[PDB]
Amino acid sequence: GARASVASGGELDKWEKIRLRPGGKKQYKLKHIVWASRELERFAVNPGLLETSEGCRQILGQLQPSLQTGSEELRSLYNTIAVLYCVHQRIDVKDTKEALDKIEEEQNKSKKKAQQAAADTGNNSQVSQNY
């Protein structure tokens, strides 16, 4: 709309800079965004959530636990939305895969810097074990 806060020109260059495959020659294009923004509108998810890295976290996290149940359609969104996330956090990816992996290894840092926080929230639940 008339109120943006992402880039509008800069990020665009980077977007088309990311490759669709690890060893391919294909790259990302508007077709992917527009398509994603639309689909989201149907999944009760505003297309504006992809505007801020924070928003994506909510989207990806939702389709995350669904990447198994959902069809190939849900897998297409996650892949895309996942990439943009890296760009929004100022992360230079090499390919669609590099993005997904980054989002993972990245979060790993938090765990290392939360040895006290994690210990505070945790318990040992001993389930049953009969014959």
Ligand X SMILES: *C(=O)CCCCCCCCCCCCC
Q: Which is nearer to ligand X, 2 or 119 (CB)?
A: 2
For residue 41, the minimal CB distance to ligand X (Å) is: 12
Per the structure block, which two tokens stand in for 66? 């669904």
CB of 51 to ligand X, least distance (A): 4
Report whether 64 contacts 81 (CB < 8 A).
Answer: no
Q: Which two tokens stand for residue 80?
A: 């895309």
Cβ nearer to ligand X, comparing 3 with 109:
3
C-alpha to C-alpha distance for 45 and 42, rounded to whole angstroms: 7
Interface ranges with ligand X (CB under 6 A): 1-4, 6, 33, 36, 50-51, 80, 84
Residue 15 CB, shortest distance to ligand X, in Å, is 6
> 55, 42, 106, 101: which is closest to 81 by C-alpha?
55
